[PDB]
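Quick one - inputs below.
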Amino acid sequence: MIVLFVDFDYFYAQVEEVLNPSLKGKPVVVCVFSGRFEDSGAVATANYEARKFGVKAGIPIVEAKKILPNAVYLPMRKEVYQQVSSRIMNLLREYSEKIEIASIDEAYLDISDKVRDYREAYNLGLEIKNKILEKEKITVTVGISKNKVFAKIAADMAKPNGIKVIDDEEVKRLIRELDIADVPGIGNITAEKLKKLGINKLVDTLSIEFDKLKGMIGEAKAKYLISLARDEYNEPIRTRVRKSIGRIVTMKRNSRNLEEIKPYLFRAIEESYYKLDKRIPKAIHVVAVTEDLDIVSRGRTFPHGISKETAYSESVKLLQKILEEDERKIRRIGVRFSKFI
DNA sequence: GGGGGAAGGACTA
DNA sequence: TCAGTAGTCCTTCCCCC
Ligand SMILES: Nc1ccn([C@H]2CC[C@@H](COP(=O)(O)OP(=O)(O)O)O2)c(=O)n1
Ligand SMILES: [Ca+2]
Ligand SMILES: [Mg+2]
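Output:
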């Protein structure tokens, strides 16, 4: 099995550079402005010029401006990025029937029935990069290996504007030398749990009792890591089907007043239904982020589709439930629809 | 023990 | 006043065979 992973380079920022070439060469930072106050919000992404200075996705916009006050700060235009992405995804579809769109700027292609070996896989990779560059003027990084996990790892090692093949011998080397924290699906929390078990490399998961590992990180992740370490991981590339659609916004001020929160909630529902387009959900969840940034949610699944009117009435009840069961003030409020018919 | 379902978590983008 | 937004899958917990 041969998997080819495509990962668009610093995507949002790159799209803004393509739409406005005068920005090339300068540090560009795409931001999510919350509106609570001047420059409140976080960085969605930044081009590599800005990253050289430590500006990365996730950091407060103010922190970024303290480090790079003269960079170009742009508001995120998600709709634009989505349209460019869909066009690029359509180009990828021409190279394989078996394609998994993981997110807005990542996709896995099973090309095992398209190429004879990694030599040809590498060439298809170059062809894919050239096609996207030709059509959309966007650079991407390609990762190639025996399965989805190592194809992605390859892309991580090669970005930006790269192409990397991780052959069978290198997979074995990585199983023994790659820090387990760099394996997809292993975040800080899980990495620390593993640390306590003396596990820092995939190979280490083969020196401990499965029972002990499963007790620390759960059966799902335990079987996952072991299959990888044993080099048996071969999960198929599956066509992605949207399971949920939602919208969450930050309020001007923290609140516990139902009438003050409702407008934000209804606005989120309107935007959610716009995005649903044709899809009809059977489940609705109201999600709230409290003043201390904890996340609380209350939902309901109906035996039928949810009309926009039902969404309005039910969302109010779910919100009242949240206010009745949690005493903290709310900072962000939103909704998420799922279980489509 | 575990199927189901709701809600809390962890993780990726 | 540092603390966004979108989406997926697994765990925890409780009711109840
Ligand atoms: N914490 C995050 C992280 C990523 N993102 C989004 C933004 C863009 C999209 C692609 O990100 P990039 O191509 O810049 O990531 P890269 O490949 O590591 O350079 O993922 C977001 O909104 N918040
Ligand atoms: Ca990317
Ligand atoms: Mg990690």
